[PDB]
Structure 1
Amino acid sequence: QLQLQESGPGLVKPSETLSLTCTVSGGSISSSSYYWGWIRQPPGKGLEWIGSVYYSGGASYNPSLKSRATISVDTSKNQFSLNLDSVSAADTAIYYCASIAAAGSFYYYYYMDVWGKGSTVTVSSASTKGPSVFPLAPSGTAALGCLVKDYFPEPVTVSWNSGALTSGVHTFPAVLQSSGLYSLSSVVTVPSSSLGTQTYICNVNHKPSNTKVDKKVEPK
């Protein structure tokens, strides 16, 4: 079915322009039955509409952002994009792709049919500090995990055994350390029967720093 895919930086400096892109698949954007657009969610806040673009070249915007934002569309690429000028700390948010379905026939009847995944974007003067990842080893039922430490900003993904390991897995939300950097950890509950028999590898990613690591956790 129709799907949206997020793309863009997780970090922009104050006063710069934030530029994000959606890729559309499972259908074409070249249709009068759809409008395409952007929504954001500052951490701890609700959703805010940014704007929308029509494949023929028209557009509409949230007045609070209209003076700063531009949304474009390209029907040969089957993509759409958002450019937000003069960014500040206020703009730290999770940005989402969305499609808008034109309901009925010839009326202003709309709903947001397909949503993106969310792209976390931080506005800051600081560098793209990547994480270091360390194993947490155990020594009935056992548990094991990975410690993800010292990074900024915080768009990170953690998975186990490349997605093979699901049940028993939990991750924790980012922790802000007094250092100004983030800490995060991930654990999995395993039987003592599999411990030391079955291997457990965490796969950790941080987009802005281009860091991709893999760590195997073994018992003592």
Structure 2
Amino acid sequence: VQLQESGPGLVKPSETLSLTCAVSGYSISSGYYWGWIRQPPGKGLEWIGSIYHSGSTYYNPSLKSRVTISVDTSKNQFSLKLSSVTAADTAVYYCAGLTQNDANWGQGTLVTVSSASTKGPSVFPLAPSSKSTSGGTAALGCLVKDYFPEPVTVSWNSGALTSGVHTFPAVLQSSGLYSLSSVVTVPSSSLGTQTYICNVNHKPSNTKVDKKVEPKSC
């Protein structure tokens, strides 16, 4: 059983947030309930609403006049509409459902409500050198710069490299754009034989980049 959210990254204020959850490995009609829960940045969980087996719905009272939850049996999906959004609706939205003591959750999708515009990242290398070596260990990475909205995902070597990776929280620069770095530490001896590529995906701008990071010459 798998739940997967899909929907816009950025939404303009006073527009309508629209999300769908695709359900695999289970029939939408068989669920006890399907629902939505959100988590504003750095804060706790807030229930939005649920729809039950009968088609009956229940919404969070503070949101109810703006919320519609429905089910598409042919797509085996369910959806959330939240009209008249403001900055306050910025949050990671999760879909959830109880199937036939433990609900299934989606992966969460960050929706940003903002009057700013989408912007793809530039990807610069953080190249290894003597200045980034400590013993037989070298650090290298990728600076993912000037993008909007969040999030970006970074992996290394298509996921084959995970040990010693640190991908940092983005920072909001004074320009209104985010900047993020992702670093990995590796054996110095590998610098001349192993290729290191950081794979960067900024889904809101549809920007994907595979950037090779090569040792400097100092």
Aligned-partner SS, 1:208 = helix
2:31, 2:53 within 8 Å by CA — same for their partners in 1? Answer: no
1:55, 1:74 within 8 Å by CA — same for their partners in 2? Answer: no
Distance 1:14 1:133, change over 3 A: same
Distance 1:137 1:28 in 2: 49
Distance 1:26 1:32, change over 3 A: closer
**Unpaired runs of at least 5, structure 2:** 96-103, 129-134
Alignment match, 1:148: 144
Task: Return the TM-score normalized by structure 2.
Answer: 0.89
Distance 1:214 1:74, change over 3 A: same
Alignment match, 2:127: 137
Shift of 1:70: 0.4
Q: What does the per-residue CA deviation read over 1:180-217, in whole Å, with 9 as the maximum and x for residues that have no partner?
A: 11000000010011112100000101111111111000
Q: What does the per-residue CA deviation read over 1:91-129, in whole Å, with 9 as the maximum and x for residues that have no partner?
A: 0001001xxxxxxxxxxxxxxxx1111100110111111
1:142, 1:192 within 8 Å by CA — same for their partners in 2? Answer: yes
Alignment match, 2:107: 117
Shift of 1:74: 1.4
Distance 1:72 1:162 in 2: 36
Alignment match, 2:99: none
The 5-angstrom pairing of residues 1-220 of structure 1 reads 2-29=1-28, 31=29, 34-97=32-95, 114-138=104-128, 140-220=136-216
How many residues are treated as equivalent by the alignment?
202
Distance 1:24 1:48, change over 3 A: same
Q: What does the per-residue CA deviation read over 1:52-91, in whole Å, with 9 as the maximum and x for residues that have no partner?
A: 1135432111111111110000122110000000000110
Distance 1:32 1:199, change over 3 A: closer
Shift of 1:33: 5.1
Shift of 1:156: 1.0
- Root-mean-square deviation (CA, aligned residues, Å) is 1.4
2:146, 2:177 within 8 Å by CA — same for their partners in 1? Answer: yes
1:53, 1:71 within 8 Å by CA — same for their partners in 2? Answer: yes
Distance 1:157 1:142 in 2: 23
1:54, 1:73 within 8 Å by CA — same for their partners in 2? Answer: no
**Unpaired runs of at least 5, structure 1:** 98-113
> Matched residues, percent identical?
91
Distance 1:96 1:33, change over 3 A: closer
1:14, 1:125 within 8 Å by CA — same for their partners in 2? Answer: yes
**Which has a greater percent of helix?**
2
1:152, 1:181 within 8 Å by CA — same for their partners in 2? Answer: yes
Distance 1:74 1:56, change over 3 A: farther
2:35, 2:50 within 8 Å by CA — same for their partners in 1? Answer: yes
Distance 1:45 1:203 in 2: 29
Q: What does the per-residue CA deviation read over 1:139-170, in whole Å, with 9 as the maximum and x for residues that have no partner?
A: 91111100000011112111111111111111
Distance 1:150 1:76 in 2: 40
Task: Return the TM-score normalized by structure 1.
Answer: 0.89
